[PDB]
Structure formats: structure tokens, C-alpha cells
């Protein structure tokens, strides 16, 4: 199918700061990936983003009932919907699963890569550090970055490039909002 | 609780 | 911000496809099944704590459809530019032989929101236990999508996520096999 496509897209966005103490509402209208008109509660009226949206900004700003709907949206829509799902979104906390396993930077190599897997957690904010014999390892650390699984869970792999010596103990340390104390997992060279 | 919809406005014809 | 809630909706011609969904900090809270005219919660448990009138979404889609017709005329029938997706295949947890796991196919940064996705096991299409998300919003207004395939890890099975998009010259295949 090589027929031309035409896409009409719109978002109604609620931005929350310090709980619901500060709230900003944005309604945005798009056509073929181009935003052409928006309402920003900071302004209180529609504004054209591009010339193609100018007729609608003017038309919509002439409708007092529409504007007052949008001006009240931070309360009737944003703060309301925030309250509706607060218990299972804002207060959602899922403990990370933490495991450590050895790997290789390339085949035909000795085990020279330590992988700290941190998975299944929520929210996405996480902090993972490596230690060797009680000292933080800041060099040779590479990671997948934060990975979203698309199902209200996240994961990450934090890897340490190192050459383990006999008797060395490596520790992966994890901080996450679901806990008030760091999680630690040890790995021992055989 | 019930999630509210922000109705969309119809562009100028 | 500390949190962001987004109601995202689109209507697409000539496919006549519409979608309505709520997003919380990047995750889907729910979408509306246009066919069944029903609310679909991303996690089953959400439905026990909250509700939503799907009829409100259908009304917005009707507006989006009307607005599309108006914009298409105004822009002189300028077609959307295809932006082909990036695809990543991964597991949701470290793989252990004979330990049940889930393959994830992440389709990202594309538009229009139309895609054909096929899971392949050893080159053969597999549909058992598969699932998928609707099209999810991005800050750059491109889309993302997740496909899932539960599986029993083995050394004798390889996997591919095959993705078709009008922005691609050929199907894009992302591979997975057991790591040594
Ligand atoms: C569409 O075509 C009309 C008629 O020629 C023209 O006046 C208008 O500027 C065009 N709009 C575009 C190219 O966005
Ligand atoms: C998906 O496959 C169908 C045929 O079943 C085809 O008509 C359609 O164009 C394909 N979509 C994409 C995005 O390739």
C-alpha cells in the first residue's frame, strides 16, 4: 500500500509539580507530525504554533465557553485524574530483582565482564554502582541505560570491565525509591 | 474514581 | 515535573484507524477498544481501582476524524512523511535454560502509527501466547509499540522480531539467541 496517509493527532497534557500544588495543562493539536495550535494554561488562550493553526486559535479563542472549560482544566481534569489513579501510579513501588553473573567482552576471552542485572522495578529512577573489596569502581563501567519494558516495569544491566583475581569479591549496589537502604549483591571469583 | 476525558475542539471548517 | 499524565488520540486516513489512550510517566494506563467500544486497562488490577466511560473517547475520535478532514483540505492534501522505526529485541529478565522468560520487541520512533509485527521461532511465524500494546506517545510525537512472546529458553531455538513499516524498503528483523 503506497497510498498517501493523513494523520490527525492530539494530546491533553497534565504536568504536576510538588504533588498537585503546582499544575500546568497543555492541549496540543497536530497534523502529520506538525503541531499547529495549542492551549497553555500559563497563557489562558489558544495560540497558533504554525500559520496552518491560526484559523483555529482565532476561532477557538472566540468561544468563551470553550476557553473557560480549558481554564478550569487544571482542577476539573488534571487534579481530578491525578487523584483518581494516585494509589496505583504515583504510589506504585516495585522492588528490583538484583543478580550478578560473569560475561565476556568477546568470545575466546576469559571472564572479563561482570554484569549486574537490575530488573522488574518501578518507578524508573535507579542508581547502580560497582565496588571491589569495599572500594567503588568508577572506571570501565558500561550500561544499557534505563530500559522500559512497556508494562509498568523497568530494567537495566550495569557492567564492569575487569580482570578478576583469585579471592576478589565484587559488589553491586542498588538504590531505588522502593527501599530506604541500598541493596547489595556479591560475586566471587573462583 | 472515574477518569475524565478533555473533550476535543472541532477546527474551523 | 514530578509526574505527567497525557491523554493521546489520533485518527488516520485512509486506514480509518483511531486510538485513544492515557499515559502516566511513559506507561499506558488504559486505551479504548474502538471495535468493542470498551475500556482496556494496561494492568488488569487497574480496573478494580478506577473506571472510565469509553463513550467519551468515541466522541473525541469523531472530532479527530472531523478535524482530519478539515486539515487535509487546508494543507492541500500533503501526505505524512514516513519515519521508519528502530527495533530492539530483549528479554525482561536474564535468561536461564528451561526457565520461563519473555521476549520483548520494542518498536520505536516511527510514524504513521501502522506496523506489521511477526514473531519468528527458527524462521517460522509463532502466535501462541503473543501479546502487544497499542501505539504509545513520545515527546517528539513519533510512536512506540511493544510486542511480547513468552518462551522456554533453549540452546536449539532462535528468535526474530520481524517489523514491516511503509518507511522501510524491506522488513526489519531483530534477532535473539541464547548467549554463552
Ligand atoms: C494550498 O493551496 C492554496 C491555493 O493555491 C494556497 O493559497 C495555500 O497557500 C496552500 N496552502 C499550503 C501550501 O499550505
Ligand atoms: C501489513 O500487511 C498487509 C497485508 O496483510 C498490507 O496490506 C499492509 O500494507 C501492511 N502494512 C505495513 C505497514 O506494511
B3 interaction partners in chain A (CB closer than 8 Å):
81, 84-85
What would the grid cell of residue C127 be? 502466535
Query: Are A96 and A187 in a shared domain?
Result: yes
Nearest residue in A to C3, CA atom: A16
Cis before residue C112, ω within 30 degrees of 0? yes
What would the grid cell of residue C50 be? 478506577
Q: How close does chain A come to B9, measured CA to CA in Å?
A: 8
Q: Kindly list the distances between the CA atom of residue A43 and the CA atoms of A58, A61, A77, C5, in Å, as whole numbers in the listed order.
A: 14, 12, 17, 20
Please give the interface size between A and C, counted as residue pairs whose CB atoms are below 8 Å apart. Answer: 162
Q: Kindly list the distances between the CA atom of residue C3 and the CA atoms of A7, A26, C133, in Å, as whole numbers in the listed order.
A: 28, 14, 22
Strands C101-110, C143-151: pairing kind: antiparallel
Determine the residue among C7, C10, C61 to mutate to test chain B binding: the one whose Cβ has the most chain B Cβ atoms within 10 Å.
C7
Distance, CA of C92 to CA of C88 (rounded, Å): 12
Query: Are A40 and A95 in a shared domain?
Result: no
> For residue A190, with 0-12 CB atoms within 10 Å meaning exposed, 13-18 middle and 19 or more buried, which class applies?
exposed
Atom of ligand 1 nearest to the CA of C76: 1
Task: List the beta bridge partners of residue C7.
Answer: A12, C22
Distance, CA of A114 to CA of A137 (rounded, Å): 12
Distance, CA of C111 to CA of A158 (rounded, Å): 32
Range of the domain at C175: 80-180
Contact status, residue A37 vs residue A48, Cβ threshold 8 Å: yes
Q: How close does chain A come to C6, measured CA to CA in Å?
A: 4
Who among C1, C64, C141 is closest to A17 (CB)?
C1
CA-angle at A14, arms to C26 and B6, nearest 5°: 105
In terms of C-beta distances under 8 Å and separation of at least 24 residues, what long-range contacts does C168-176 make, across chains too? C168/C84, C168/C85, C172/C84, C172/C85, C172/C87, C173/C120, C174/C87, C174/C88, C174/C89, C174/C105, C175/C89, C176/C89, C176/C90, C176/C91, C176/C103
Nearest residue in B to C68, CA atom: B11
Range of the domain at A77: 1-90
Going by C-alpha positions, the residue among C7, C164, C12 that lies closest to residue A33 is C12
Who among A56, A77, A83 is closest to B1 (CB)?
A83
Q: Kindly list the distances between the CA atom of residue C124 and the CA atoms of C116, C119, C159, C160, C161, in Å, as whole numbers in the listed order.
A: 16, 8, 9, 9, 11
CATH of the domain at A160: 2.60.40.10
**How many domains does chain C fold into?**
2
Query: Are C97 and C174 in a shared domain?
Result: yes
Distance, CA of C77 to CA of C45 (rounded, Å): 44
Q: Report the nearest-CA residue for atom 2 of ligand 1.
A: C76
Who among A15, A29, A85 is closest to C29 (CB)?
A85
Strands C51-52, C38-41: pairing kind: unpaired
Query: Are A3 and A75 in a shared domain?
Result: yes
Q: Kindly list the distances between the CA atom of residue A124 and the CA atoms of A145, A150, A153, C30, in Å, as whole numbers in the listed order.
A: 11, 11, 8, 19
Q: Kindly list the distances between the CA atom of residue A121 and the CA atoms of A41, A92, A95, C175, in Å, as whole numbers in the listed order.
A: 34, 10, 5, 25
Q: Which of C79, C103, C118 is the last residue of a domain?
A: C79
Going by C-alpha positions, the residue among A34, A127, A14 that lies closest to residue A76 is A14
SS3 C29: strand
Contact status, residue A155 vs residue A147, Cβ threshold 8 Å: yes
Distance C12 CA to ligand 1 centre (A): 22
Query: Are C71 and C20 in a shared domain?
Result: yes
Query: Are A75 and A98 in a shared domain?
Result: no
Going by C-alpha positions, the residue among C130, C23, C170, B9 that lies closest to residue A62 is B9
> For residue A57, with 0-12 CB atoms within 10 Å meaning exposed, 13-18 middle and 19 or more buried, which class applies?
buried
What would the grid cell of residue C143 be? 510512536
Query: Are A79 and A96 in a shared domain?
Result: no
Distance C75 CA to ligand 1 centre (A): 7
Q: How close does chain A come to B3, measured CA to CA in Å?
A: 5
Residues in chain C: 180
Going by C-alpha positions, the residue among A16, A13, A14, A48 that lies closest to residue A31 is A48
Please state, as a whole number, how many other Cβ atoms lie within 10 Å of the Cβ of residue C70: 18
In terms of DSSP H, where are the helices of chain C?
Answer: 46-49, 54-74
What would the grid cell of residue A167 be? 579471592
Contact status, residue B10 vs residue C62, Cβ threshold 8 Å: no
Region label for C16, one of left (φ > 0), alpha (ψ between -120 and 50) or beta (otherwise): left
Technique used: X-ray
Scanning the structure block, which residue is given the C-alpha cell 569495599? A134
Contact status, residue C160 vs residue C175, Cβ threshold 8 Å: yes
Contact status, residue A176 vs residue A126, Cβ threshold 8 Å: yes
> For residue A164, with 0-12 CB atoms within 10 Å meaning exposed, 13-18 middle and 19 or more buried, which class applies?
buried
Distance, CA of A134 to CA of A112 (rounded, Å): 19
SS3 C103: strand
Nearest residue in A to B5, CA atom: A77
Distance C13 CA to ligand 2 centre (A): 15
Contact status, residue A160 vs residue A137, Cβ threshold 8 Å: yes
Contact status, residue A147 vs residue C90, Cβ threshold 8 Å: yes
CATH of the domain at A9: 3.10.320.10
Distance, CA of A167 to CA of A105 (rounded, Å): 22
Going by C-alpha positions, the residue among C8, C103, C139, C26 that lies closest to residue A150 is C26
Q: Which of A60, A90, A120 is the last residue of a domain?
A: A90
Q: Residue C88: phi, psi to the nearest 5?
A: -135, 130
Nearest residue in B to A12, CA atom: B6
A10 interaction partners in chain B (CB closer than 8 Å):
8
Distance, CA of C107 to CA of C104 (rounded, Å): 10
Q: What is the resolution of the experimental data for this entry, in Å?
A: 2.0
Neighbours of chain B (3+ CB pairs under 8 A): A, C
What would the grid cell of residue A180 be? 530506604
Quick check: CB of C166 below 6 Å from ligand 2? yes
Please state, as a whole number, how many other Cβ atoms lie within 10 Å of the Cβ of residue C143: 25
Distance, CA of C24 to CA of B1 (rounded, Å): 16
Q: How close does chain C come to B9, measured CA to CA in Å?
A: 7
Q: Which of A21, A55, A90 is the last residue of a domain?
A: A90
Contact status, residue A96 vs residue A140, Cβ threshold 8 Å: no
Provide residues with CB under 6 Å of ligand 1.
Answer: C 75-76
Distance C79 CA to ligand 1 centre (A): 14
What would the grid cell of residue C63 be? 472530532
The order of strands in the sheet holding A135-137 is A135-137, A127-132, A169-175, A183-188
In terms of DSSP H, where are the helices of chain A?
Answer: 54-61, 64-71, 73, 80-85
Task: List the beta bridge partners of residue A89.
Answer: none
Distance, CA of A151 to CA of C34 (rounded, Å): 21
SS3 C18: strand
**How many domains does chain A fold into?**
2
Strands A6-17, A22-31: pairing kind: antiparallel
DSSP A83-95: HHHGGGTTT--BP
Rounded to a whole number, what is the distance in angstroms from the first to the last CA of chain C?
Answer: 42
Distance A67 CA to ligand 1 centre (A): 29
Please state, as a whole number, how many other Cβ atoms lie within 10 Å of the Cβ of residue A3: 10
Scanning the structure block, which residue is given the C-alpha cell 493553526? A53
Contact status, residue C70 vs residue B8, Cβ threshold 8 Å: no
Amino acid at each position: 500500500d503506497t497510498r498517501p496517509r493523513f494523520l490527525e493527532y492530539s494530546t491533553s497534557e497534565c504536568h504536576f509539580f510538588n504533588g498537585t500544588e503546582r499544575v500546568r495543562f497543555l492541549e496540543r493539536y497536530f497534523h502529520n507530525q506538525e503541531e499547529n495550535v495549542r492551549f497553555d494554561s500559563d497563557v489562558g488562550e489558544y495560540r497558533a504554533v504554525t500559520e496552518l493553526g491560526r484559523p483555529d486559535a482565532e476561532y477557538w479563542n472566540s468561544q468563551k465557553d470553550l476557553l473557560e472549560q480549558r481554564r478550569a482544566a487544571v482542577d476539573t481534569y488534571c487534579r481530578h485524574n491525578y487523584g483518581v489513579g494516585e494509589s496505583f501510579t504515583v504510589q506504585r513501588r516495585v522492588h528490583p530483582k538484583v543478580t550478578v553473573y560473569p560475561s565476556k567482552t568477546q568470545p575466546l576471552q576469559h571472564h572479563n565482564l561482570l554484569v549486574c542485572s537490575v530488573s522488574g522495578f518501578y518507578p524508573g529512577s535507579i542508581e547502580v554502582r560497582w565496588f571491589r573489596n569495599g572500594q567503588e569502581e568508577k572506571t570501565g563501567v558500561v550500561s544499557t541505560g534505563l530500559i522500559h519494558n512497556g508494562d509498568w516495569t523497568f530494567q537495566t544491566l550495569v557492567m564492569l570491565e575487569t580482570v578478576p583475581r583469585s579471592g576478589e569479591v565484587y559488589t553491586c549496589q542498588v538504590e531505588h525509591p522502593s527501599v530506604t537502604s541500598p541493596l547489595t549483591v556479591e560475586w566471587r571469583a573462583t | 474514581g472515574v477518569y475524565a476525558t478533555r473533550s476535543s475542539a472541532v477546527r474551523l471548517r | 515535573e514530578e509526574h505527567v499524565i497525557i491523554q493521546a488520540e489520533f485518527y488516520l486516513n485512509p486506514d480509518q484507524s483511531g486510538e485513544f489512550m492515557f499515559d502516566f510517566d511513559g506507561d499506558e494506563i488504559f486505551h479504548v477498544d474502538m471495535a468493542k467500544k470498551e475500556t482496556v486497562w494496561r494492568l488488569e488490577e487497574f480496573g478494580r481501582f478506577a473506571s472510565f466511560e469509553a463513550q467519551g473517547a468515541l466522541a473525541n475520535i469523531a472530532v479527530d476524524k472531523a478535524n482530519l478532514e478539515i486539515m487535509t483540505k487546508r494543507s492541500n492534501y500533503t501526505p505524512i512523511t514516513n519515519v521508519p522505526p528502530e527495533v530492539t529485541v530483549l528479554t525482561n529478565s536474564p535468561v536461564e535454560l528451561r526457565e520461563p522468560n519473555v521476549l520483548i520487541c520494542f518498536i520505536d520512533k516511527f510514524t504513521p502509527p501502522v506496523v506489521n509485527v511477526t514473531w519468528l521461532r527458527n524462521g517460522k511465524p509463532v502466535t501462541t501466547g503473543v501479546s502487544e500494546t497499542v501505539f504509545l506517545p513520545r515527546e517528539d510525537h513519533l510512536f512506540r509499540k511493544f510486542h511480547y512472546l513468552p518462551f522456554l529458553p533453549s540452546t536449539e531455538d532462535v528468535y526474530d522480531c520481524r517489523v514491516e513499516h511503509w518507511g522501510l524498503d524491506e522488513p526489519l528483523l531483530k534477532h535473539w539467541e541464547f548467549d554463552t
